[PDB]
Every structure is written in C-alpha cells, then in structure tokens.
C-alpha cells in the first residue's frame, strides 16, 4: 500500500546491512525532489526552434532525518550508528518501493546535521542531504531460456509412416513441418531485451587453462565485448561485478579469494554497456546473473 | 603453498593451502614473519620488494623475526620462475665417510 | 598530509670540496646538511620525474627560492643496480624551489631537470654511447646543483646514441628528452644515507634503475572511468607540409624563370613527382598540406636530389599520450614497459610520470611508437 524507503550499506553483497527509514528507529520523511531537471540546449532562429541534446540532470535529495528513541542515550547511539554506517561504505544504495515498482538509487552523503533542539526523550529532527550517483535503476535476476522440441503429428511432420516403406505427402499449408532437432538441449539463450549498464555475475568454470568467462553478441551475431579469464587451476567460481564504483573480478577456490584482473583478456573487454542481443558462456558449466538497468523518472 | 613445512628460528610450522598475493612484473621475496606477542597467530607470510631478513633472536629476546625462504619472479599475468633460499648448515667439525658435491667446495 | 624536509640550496661551490675526514681517516666530499625545518607538505600536485608538468605545493614553514624540498613516504622502492644486487632505497620526491607566492604556495621543479640547467652539449660528445652522455650530464663540477652518485641500468643505456640534427650544439634538456624518449626511461632524484655503515654522510643520487634489471613488457587495459586525457606528442622533428611546389633557378637568367615541379608524398612514405602519378588516390593522403620551396642550383648545375626534398616533406612521429587514474586492480609504476588497451585501440609505450595529489593518483603514458 504505502511506500517503503530502505538504506543499504552494500547491496549485491554478503556484508549487507539494511536500515528501514520508513518503519525503523531512524526515519526519512518528506523527500525534497524525486523528479528531474532537463537542459535541452534549445536555440531559436527567426521564430523557428532548433533543439540540441537533452542532459537529464539529477538533483540532491534532502530528507528529514528523525529518530525515535526511549532515552537520550538511545538517540545519540542512533545518530552515531546510522551516519558512520553511511560513511563506512563509499556509497549507499537507497531503495524506493511502492505498490507498482521497486527502483534503487546510488547515493553519496552530501550533508548531515546535528543540533541541540531535542524533543521528547532526546529525539533528533535533522536534514540529511544526498548526492546522486545514479537515479532509479532496476536490480533484477537474469536467466537463460530453454528450447523444447515440437510434437510429432501424422501427415504434418516429416516421417515415413503408415503403409511400408513409409510416406510423407506434400500438401498446401499443412504439408511437412520438421518436428524439432536431435539434441535440442544444446540450445540456450541468455536474452538481453533492453540496454543494461552494470551486472553481478557468479560464473562456475569447466576446464582449467582454457579461457573461461562470458561474451556478448549483438542483434546480427557479432561480439562487441567479452569478460574472459585464463586461470591455471579450476576456480570453484569467478565472482564478477561490472559496477564502475567498486569493480570486482575475483576468483574463488575453497575459502581463498584470488584477484583475476591481470589474468583477464583486455582486448575482448571493449565495453561495459551491454546492448540488445544475447550472451554466451565460455568454458562455463553454470552461471547466475543479476542485471541492473537504469530508468530516468519513476 | 599446498603443503610446505618451515622451521624458522627453530620454530616448526606448516603451510596448508596458504595463498600469498604477488606484485606484477616484480621479483617477490616471500618472508616468514614470527611475532610471539600475537599469541593467537604468531606466523604470518608476506611477499616483499627485497630480502628483508632481520635475524631477530625471538627465543632469547623480543621482536619480530623476518626470514626469506622463496623468491618468486612474476610477469604481468602470472609467475615466470621460482628460486628457493639456500639452507645454511653451520657446523664445527665433520667426521664423514663419503661425500657428493653438485656445486663447489 | 606528507612529511617534507627543507634544506638550503645544495650549492656545489660548498659541498663539492673533499675535505671531510672519514672515521677511518680518509678525506671525502662534504655530506648533505640536516633540514633547517621539518614541515608538512599540503595542497599538493607532486610529479615523480617531471616529464610534462612542474610540481606545486603549499608548505607549513616559510620556504624561500633556492631551498631543496625532500618529500617523504613511509614506503620503500627496490632498485636493481646490478644483475643480482638489489638495494633497499626509501621513497623520496626531491625538488628545488623556483618561486613562492604571497599564500606560501611553492612552485617545485624536479631536482634532475633543475640540475642539468643551462648546460650545453656539442655533437662530439653525442657521437659515443648513451653512457658517455649520462656521465657528462651528471657531474657536480659542472652542474648548478650538487650530485654525489648515479645509479644506472646498463642494458637500457647500452645502445648507440640517437643521431643529432645538423650536428649542432644542443642544450642538456633537449638531448636528455631525445635520449629518454628512445630508451623509454625517466630519471628520479633520491636522498639516502651512504651505503657503508662507517660513512655517516647523507647523500643525494640520481636514479636510472628499475625493479627489474631486464625490463619485461606488461599488457593492460585503461577504462574511460579513470578520467583519461588523450593528447598527441611529437618525438622526432620532421616537416608538416606534405606537398611541395618546388622551384629551380634557371642558369642562363640567374632567375626562377622556369615553371615549378610539384612533389607528393605517398601513404607508404615514398616521394614522387605529382605529374608521374597514375593511380586512383587510395595511396595518397586524405588532406593536402602544401608549401612552396626555393632551391639554388649546385656548382655542378644539376637540379636538387629527390631525397633532399623528401627529408623536408617527410612525416613526423605522431605519438599518443594518456593521463589516467591509478588502477588498484593492476598498479602501474614509473619506468615500466606497458601495452595499453583504450576504447578498442592498442597503444604501446612506458609510464613517464606519476602525480601524488590529495584527491587522486595519476599516470602519464607515452606511446614510444615504432609500430610497423
Ligand atoms: Sr557493492
């Protein structure tokens, strides 16, 4: 029904800590602006209007930080905790949730205020300003699609049936349609329908010393970028994060974490921006993907 | 180090699948660091720029003992060559029957 | 902040004298003094070699023009001075104060380039190996600033010295730049106490050594996120008007009465007469840069050689420079041979400079060229 705001220390990560700024002890109220400012570069010559390129500018969100605590000790402990937790990580992801959507914004602490105007049992009523890194993006699960063989029908499918030594008839419209393909289980498509900007993939390699990773193809079947690694031993999994702010390319074997950046193929990795098409798995047995895609206004 | 046993300053310890990070296109000097004050974990490993062996008497006095055991030469991608540190056997008098030398006396 | 040691000018008119009595009894050169004031370098842009820009930093103590500033870092750099011999050297950034403003912001010039100042070198010295030029340039008997020793990697400066244009007298700055471009190396000045424990002197040395005696080539990628600055440099000086309207003076008239002969340079590198061309334009340049040349007939009377015209219309070394943030996933230090991938294109060269600022850590990449 009502909206939900949730501050995350590290989303997409094991060391995550979530603060409910809607229901918890420390709450965010009356956001300054959730919209957007656009600058279209319009120049008018003799009454006729010419439009350039629109630079969608995102403005600082200023909240109304309010703590609810049983004692003065409790609210001072809340301010020291919530702020340090935002300061501890270089950037904090604010989740925007409503009946219809679940968007996210990457924020950086711009300004926080601490004053001595306490209410009852020493309760804070302050202004918390944030700088916009990326405004509104959808964090969703990306999975491959499987292809299944069509059913075999007498007269419709290509088979030599009925009276010996078989018969298939050329009709008009119904004629002969191939049932499927021998070993249809080989075909798998990791479909990309809209342009994505960053992702958190968990890749499980097959063979050691053979380049292992992912490659991306466009609408015409041409490779534009590829994250691939040539390791000496089989890693249990290669944890990759394409996020610009905290780029991670690490391999895991047992309880040991290895940085795989120098072993990576630098020539194939041309871009981070993934375009409309499909994704292929190079020397991978299994893969788990989480795709984050931007939305200007939500 | 899958399974490597080391006796540094007369102190025995085993390295069981202990991985140590290296510097790209550099000659890494792997050291065995012993700090007796760190009662929970006295032995720690470190890949360094140069052979920073101190020779601190940890058994009689205080301090942190540093001693190089392996020299790992690396490239931009991985490891090129590995040369281990010599094991010095300081003795007073030898009463031996036979000997085979691979280098020089 | 960083720690800074401020000393008065290392005057070679004072420090070059070998009157200091060593503990054994021997008479050696005067050692460097103690800092007149220990301060802290703040609001800084500090380069490692000073390849392109001059350093600038505000200092707590009121330093004056001439003073030497030694910026300290709690880390160590291992230089390979001999095939197997590697020495423990402390990280230092040594500069000369060139000018201080009202707000005490000092303009710092890297010690080496401030040492080889106003020094001129004739073609005669440049005829030998690169070692002979380095041994000439680094001398406390000649230089404006005091020098004690030089560390140099024999393999990198082993090659024959680059050929000088017109065989003229060049400045120590121009020759060093020409040499450092071909050898793909940059110098670093370092203050460190004498190697022998008996010698108690603090000394200043110039570094031409690397972490690897036999330097290896690295392969890396530079992403657009690292605030990359692309600009084109020129290593070798060659002329810019690819087309030449060449005039030859008539012997009988002692005038330029005869019509001109036009010469065009092909994409391959060869120079042909424009009239002789029979192609489709694919082998010719995309833009025609032209100049009018006047030549005087030789004593023999023959027209000037095609090859002599060719040198004047020949192309210059178009080189790409990349300035970007330090990647902690694959760190790139000064004096390292690298192969950088940027926006789908491969650029090959070395890391010339490094800026140590309050906000970022950046590198200057110089594409050495010599691609085909
Ligand atoms: Sr993260």
Swiss-Prot record, chain B:
Chain segments annotated as coiled-coil in the UniProt record: none
Localisation: Virion
Top-rank lineage group of the source organism: Viruses
Cleavable signal peptide: none
Similarity section: Belongs to the skunalikevirus receptor binding protein family.
Record text on subunit structure and interactions: Homotrimer; found as an assembly of 6 homotrimers. Interacts with host phosphopolysaccharides; this allows the virus to bind the external cell wall layer. Interacts with the distal tail protein.
Function statement: Binds to the host phosphopolysaccharides at the onset of infection. Upon activation by calcium, the receptor binding proteins change their conformation, presenting their binding sites to the host, and a channel opens at the bottom of the baseplate for DNA ejection.
Entry text on domains: The C-terminus is involved in host receptor binding. Host-recognition domains point upwards, towards the capsid.
Name of the protein described by the UniProt record: Receptor binding protein
